[PDB]
Amino acid sequence: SVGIVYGDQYRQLCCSSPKFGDRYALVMDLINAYKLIPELSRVPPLQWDSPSRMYEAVTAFHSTEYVDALKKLQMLHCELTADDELLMDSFSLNYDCPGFPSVFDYSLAAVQGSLAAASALICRHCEVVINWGGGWHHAKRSEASGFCYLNDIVLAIHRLVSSTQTRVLYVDLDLHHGDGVEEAFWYSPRVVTFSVHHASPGFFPGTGTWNMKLPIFLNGAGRGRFSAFNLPLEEGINDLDWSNAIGPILDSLNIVIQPSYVVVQCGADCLATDPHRIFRLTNFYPLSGYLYAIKKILSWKVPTLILGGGGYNFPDTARLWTRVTALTIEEVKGKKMTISPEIPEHSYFSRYGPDFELDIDYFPHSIQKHHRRILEQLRNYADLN
Numbered sequence: 001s002v003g004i005v006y007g008d009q010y011r012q013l014c015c016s017s018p019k020f021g022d023r024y025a026l027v028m029d030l031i032n033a034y035k036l037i038p039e040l041s042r043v044p045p046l047q048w049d050s051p052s053r054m055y056e057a058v059t060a061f062h063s064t065e066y067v068d069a070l071k072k073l074q075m076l077h078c079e080l081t082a083d084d085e086l087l088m089d090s091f092s093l094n095y096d097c098p099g100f101p102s103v104f105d106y107s108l109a110a111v112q113g114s115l116a117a118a119s120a121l122i123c124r125h126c127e128v129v130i131n132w133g134g135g136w137h138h139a140k141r142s143e144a145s146g147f148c149y150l151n152d153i154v155l156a157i158h159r160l161v162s163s164t165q166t167r168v169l170y171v172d173l174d175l176h177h178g179d180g181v182e183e184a185f186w187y188s189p190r191v192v193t194f195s196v197h198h199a200s201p202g203f204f205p206g207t208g209t210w211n212m213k214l215p216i217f218l219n220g221a222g223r224g225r226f227s228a229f230n231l232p233l234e235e236g237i238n239d240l241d242w243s244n245a246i247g248p249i250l251d252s253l254n255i256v257i258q259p260s261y262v263v264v265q266c267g268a269d270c271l272a273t274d275p276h277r278i279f280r281l282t283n284f285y286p287l288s289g290y291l292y293a294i295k296k297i298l299s300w301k302v303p304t305l306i307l308g309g310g311g312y313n314f315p316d317t318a319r320l321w322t323r324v325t326a327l328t329i330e331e332v333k334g335k336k337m338t339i340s341p342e343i344p345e346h347s348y349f350s351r352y353g354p355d356f357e358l359d360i361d362y363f364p365h366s367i368q369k370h371h372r373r374i375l376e377q378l379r380n381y382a383d384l385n
């Protein structure tokens with residue numbers, strides 16, 4: 001059984017941000033055009049009985065002041081003083097993470113979806129749950145970052161590890177380092193975080209690499225030491241090299257940690273067609289690195305959460321996440337989901353030009369040391385625990 005988060009309210013909220021616009025609509029509608037919805041259980045966003053119940057849930061990670069400020073920001077944008085500016089600036093609610101009429105409703109909705117997905121996994125209603133509206137891994141306890149205002153991921157994991165020793169393995173496939181999720185669990189050995197990403201001088205967010213005798217690689221602290229794994233890669237990596245880099249690490253993490261739940265952030269800014277143009281991954285299937293990683297994770301047969309994330313080429317993002325959904329249906333339910341190479345006709349068909357194919361329009365054409373480092377860390381982590 002495979003679940004997917006969507007709904008009327010969820011849709012408009014997820015499409016109300018200025019940075020991602022209608023991206024969520026394209027994803028859900030392409031999946032729908034391919035007749036996959038009949039194979040998926042809808043997971044309705046989580047709702048609360050009172051504003052106080054909502055606050056306690058969101059303040060499980062964020063501070064009351066920050067949540068307060070995010071709430072006020074929406075109010076002000078729905079119609080600013082000098083003191084307000086200093087207040088907003090103190091939470092980074094400016095510049096990269098500005099406000100808009102629905103800034104709070106938009107951020108909370110992601111939390112609503114990811115929390116519902118975790119409960120769907122906890123009560124065993126679904127073996128895997130997808131949420132293309134979540135995955136905002138940059139949100140910090142009291143700080144917005146990289147257009148991430150509330151960390152739906154952290155709250156979801158908290159719910160998972162809180163349920164009836166539970167250990168959760170977090171895999172971050174986004175092009176950017178998943179700093180927010182990593183810092184939240186810096187001190188906890190019960191949540192092992194693994195992020196593969198690009199890193200270089202001046203590149204956002206700057207973390208997930210060496211620190212500065214010689215450089216050192218931080219990996220948690222306290223009881224959580226050796227619990228934060230990072231693999232930074234240089235620009236230009238292809239599907240093969242990427243899968244080869246993360247492959248053995250993924251296997252070894254599942255073997256050593258034996259997770260009770262796996263949370264996968266599947267941000268789509270690694271595609272060769274993303275505006276960043278850093279990695280050269282595709283969405284191909286005869287092979288895409290994304291699908292190779294999801295297939296390997298699903299093979300573990302562990303209750304898994306699949307989240308969205310970055311991705312500013314909206315059509316190609318939907319192109320990738322549609323195949324992830326189909327592949328998930330194949331692995332979990334055992335029913336092959338042969339997809340049509342041709343994009344099917346639907347409301348957003350125009351946006352998929354000029355070729356209107358499911359494959360992204362791209363023609364493709366060191367890590368060894370990191371493996372030894374990461375293996376040593378895994379041995380240090382296994383022993384420590």
Ligand SMILES: CN1CCC2(CC1)c1ccccc1N(Cc1ccc(C(=O)NO)s1)[C@H]2c1ccc(Cl)cc1
Pocket residue numbers: 182183184186207208209211218230
């Ligand atoms: C503002 N607030 C101050 C406290 C700090 C960041 C946020 C924090 C809050 C909660 C848990 C941990 C941590 N930090 C320790 C680290 C976490 C990941 C690291 C890495 O290097 N990953 O690759 S270091 C601090 C930090 C994080 C990043 C930087 Cl650049 C500087 C300081």
Ligand SMILES: [K+]
Pocket residue numbers: 172173174175176177178195196197
């Ligand atoms: K990442």
Ligand SMILES: [K+]
Pocket residue numbers: 185186187188189190191192193220224227228
């Ligand atoms: K950890």
Ligand SMILES: [Zn+2]
Pocket residue numbers: 174175176267269309310311
């Ligand atoms: Zn990203």
